[PDB]
Design a protein around this ligand. Structure first.
Ligand SMILES: NC(=O)c1ccc[n+]([C@@H]2O[C@H](COP(=O)([O-])OP(=O)(O)OC[C@H]3O[C@@H](n4cnc5c(N)ncnc54)[C@H](OP(=O)(O)O)[C@@H]3O)[C@@H](O)[C@H]2O)c1
Ligand SMILES: C[C@]12C=CC(=O)C=C1CC[C@@H]1[C@@H]2C(=O)C[C@@]2(C)[C@H]1CC[C@]2(O)/C(O)=C/O
Length: 325
């Protein structure tokens, strides 16, 4: 079915999305300049046709640099590349949405993005600081109004600035809000959330499928496990006994096993790697398939524990991780 040359799955709005993509977040201070650009280029050469990024990653300009060069050389046409950008918490004010998208378009130097999503359901105080906090370190929040923000996102698609609209880190309630919104124009086609063998998102996935919403699994390899923000209570996902055991069976790494797992269930994966060898390794997941029994055993690894909890914002009205899903 899915192959290296053809692995795009349909979105509810008529568009399609490559089931595998390259994630581009990397610790700014511990990441060499140009690393993201080089990686995106290698990814496209390897076969990737989906790049997931965000203005707040502070490297969106490198992403554009790489994409434009590949188009310029004729490696791919703009329509062959799928780029996803995100609207940060400090840009949820309706009037700020379009200008925020336009900024990203100017940074990437492209006419449009394939997918633009609300980064988090929580709104933070607008400004030049992506992490608002007063003198006491108290997080400066802002009253959220998802419906209004969405209408602003819908306007962007009406203007032809983005092909598809979606969300990220949205729970069932927040999704319903948009889905049941009076006079809804464009339903969200995707919800990007943490998803892997240790957090399979069983209920959220079923809900999203009822509405034809595709789930993009971020941190599909269990994250970089940076203690500064990652909950390390759970052991290294890639060190899992079963995942590695199944890997020996197909002569694949645990990383490849976990990526095959999600894409085989229709979940898009956006593994991040700025390493030449690992970028290639993560794409080699079309030359084999997991048996149903194996698929069920891997799913059974679910621990219901998030690597990305974002506890520092558990008090924000829109914190999405309080509910079961
Ligand atoms: N929307 C949201 O709220 C949200 C949140 C977090 C992340 N994301 C997106 O999701 C992407 C993926 O998640 P993530 O970066 O957190 O995590 P991840 O993709 O789960 O894991 C990345 C870590 O794994 C390493 N790695 C990559 N391939 C490997 C392989 N084959 N074997 C062993 N280690 C490997 C990477 O190091 P090397 O680079 O050295 O290979 C890096 O430290 C992000 O980069 C971003 O585009 C979205
Ligand atoms: C999840 C998150 C927000 C949405 C997104 O697309 C990607 C990321 C990955 C990096 C996270 C970021 C945050 O939410 C803020 C964090 C957690 C940052 C790493 C350190 C950080 O910048 C911090 O500690 C300041 O608050």
């Amino acid at each position: 079915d899915l192959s290296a040359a053809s692995h795009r799955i349909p979105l509810s709005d008529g568009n399609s999305i490559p089931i595998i993509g390259l994630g581009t977040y990397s610790e700014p201070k511990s990441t060499p300049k140009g690393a993201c650009a080089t990686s995106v280029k290698v990814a496209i050469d390897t076969g990737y046709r989906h790049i997931d990024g965000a203005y707040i990653y502070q490297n969106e300009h490198e992403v554009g640099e790489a994409i434009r060069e590949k188009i310029a050389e004729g490696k791919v046409r703009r329509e062959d590349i799928f780029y996803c950008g995100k609207l940060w918490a400090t840009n949820h004010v309706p009037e700020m949405v379009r200008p925020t998208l336009e900024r990203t378009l100017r940074v990437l130097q492209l006419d449009y993005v394939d997918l633009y999503i609300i980064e988090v359901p929580m709104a933070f105080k607008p400004g030049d600081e992506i992490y608002p906090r007063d003198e006491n370190g108290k997080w400066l929040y802002h009253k959220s109004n998802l419906c209004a923000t969405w209408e602003a996102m819908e306007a962007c698609k009406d203007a032809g600035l983005v092909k598809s609209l979606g969300v990220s880190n949205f729970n069932r309630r927040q999704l319903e809000l948009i889905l049941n919104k009076p006079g809804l124009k464009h339903k969200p086609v995707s919800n990007q959330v943490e998803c892997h063998p240790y957090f399979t998102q069983p209920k959220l996935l079923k809900f999203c499928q009822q509405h034809d919403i595709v789930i993009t699994a971020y941190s599909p390899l269990g994250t970089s496990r940076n203690p500064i923000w990652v909950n390390v209570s759970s052991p290294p996902l890639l060190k899992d006994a079963l995942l590695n055991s199944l890997g020996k069976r197909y002569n694949k790494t645990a990383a490849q096993i976990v990526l095959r797992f999600n894409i085989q269930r229709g979940v898009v994966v956006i593994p991040k790697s700025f390493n030449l060898e690992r970028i290639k390794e993560n794409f080699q997941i079309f030359d084999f398939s997991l048996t149903e029994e194996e698929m069920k055993d891997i799913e059974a690894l679910n621990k219901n524990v998030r690597f990305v909890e974002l506890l520092m914002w558990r008090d924000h009205p829109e914190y999405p991780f309080h509910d079961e899903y």
